[PDB]
């Protein structure tokens, strides 16, 4: 009988409130979730790029800096993979749910006042736009300073962090979106290309799309 070690966490109260607003409100332009996840990947890639200038050894865990987009119709998932700096277990805990960082509170209050979802990434909470289209999100991540971990949440006020012994990452972050039944358009090649073109043209790392036959 194999094993993983897991810990359950409560979302910080304002993040939980924010996620509820995201999950339960109609917004047009839900398509921006992908721009936000790509931009998160870009930010993480910048960190390893500039850190590599003074310490090339940080690239031992993977030299190519790039982004992969992987839709899977049968799994009903859209996966975004990057070879950015990655997150430690403590990074996952501190940055993906237990602390209301940056513009978390400001943006929550803005949505409360009936604001658009569009500027979510400017407030430092772009990751949570995933829940515009996903019922469940899994984040696999590997940083040079720690082991590989899986972060997991279907919202409802909690998330888990566990050891992960699947396919090795090397270094970076994979975000797996389990799509809602009425959001399956984002599994289609044409739609992904449309939204990358409209919102992610200036991203300064190579993006590869894996088109299903
Ligand atoms: C502390 C050093 N690590 C990072 O900054 C980092 C960030 C990411 C990353 C990613 O590569 C892709 C994503 O979709 C998200 C990522 O991290 C986060 C976590 C939370 C937010 N947020 O909006 O609250 C954004 C990016 O990976 N490593």
For 58: left if phi > 0, alpha if psi spans -120 to 50, otherwise beta; the answer is alpha
CB of 22 shorter than 6 A to ligand 1: no
- Assign 205 to helix, strand or coil: coil
Residue nearest (by alpha carbon) to ligand 1 atom 16: 40
Gap from CA of 3 to ligand 1 centroid (Å) = 27
Counting Cβ atoms within 10 Å, is residue 60 exposed (0-12), middle (13-18) or buried (19+)?
exposed
Residue nearest (by alpha carbon) to ligand 1 atom 23: 125
- Assign 108 to helix, strand or coil: helix
Resolution to 1 decimal place, in Å: 2.0
CB of 129 shorter than 6 A to ligand 1: no
Per-residue burial over 11-42, b if 16 or more Cβ lie within 10 Å, else e, is beeebbbbbbbbeeeebeebbbbbbbbbbbbb
Residue whose pair of structure tokens reads 């409360």 in the numeric block = 112
Q: Quick one: which atom of ligand 1 is closest to the CA of 102?
A: 24
Give the domains, in start order, of the chain with CATH numbers.
1-213 (3.30.565.10)
Q: Is residue 51 within 8 Å of residue 109, measured between CB atoms? A: no
């Amino acid at each position: 009988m194999e094993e993983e070690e897991v810990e359950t966490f409560a979302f910080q109260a304002e993040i939980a409130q924010l996620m509820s607003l995201i999950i339960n409100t109609f917004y047009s332009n839900k398509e921006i979730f992908l721009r936000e996840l790509i931009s998160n990947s870009s930010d993480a890639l910048d960190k390893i790029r500039y850190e590599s200038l003074t310490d090339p050894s940080k690239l031992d865990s993977g030299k190519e800096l790039h982004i992969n987009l992987i839709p899977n119709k049968q799994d009903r998932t859209l996966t975004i993979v990057d070879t950015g700096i990655g997150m430690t277990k403590a990074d996952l805990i501190n940055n993906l749910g237990t602390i209301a960082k940056s513009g978390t509170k400001a943006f929550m209050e803005a949505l409360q006042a009936g604001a658009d979802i569009s500027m979510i990434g400017q407030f430092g909470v772009g990751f949570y736009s995933a829940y515009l289209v996903a019922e469940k999100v899994t984040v696999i991540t590997k940083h040079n300073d720690d082991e590989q971990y899986a972060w997991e949440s279907s919202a409802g006020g909690s998330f888990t962090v566990r050891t992960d012994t699947g396919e090795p990452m090397g270094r970076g972050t994979k975000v797996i979106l389990h799509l809602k039944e009425d959001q399956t358009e984002y599994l289609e090649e044409r739609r992904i290309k449309e939204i990358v073109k409209k919102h992610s043209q200036f991203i300064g790392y190579p993006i590869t799309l894996f088109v299903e036959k």
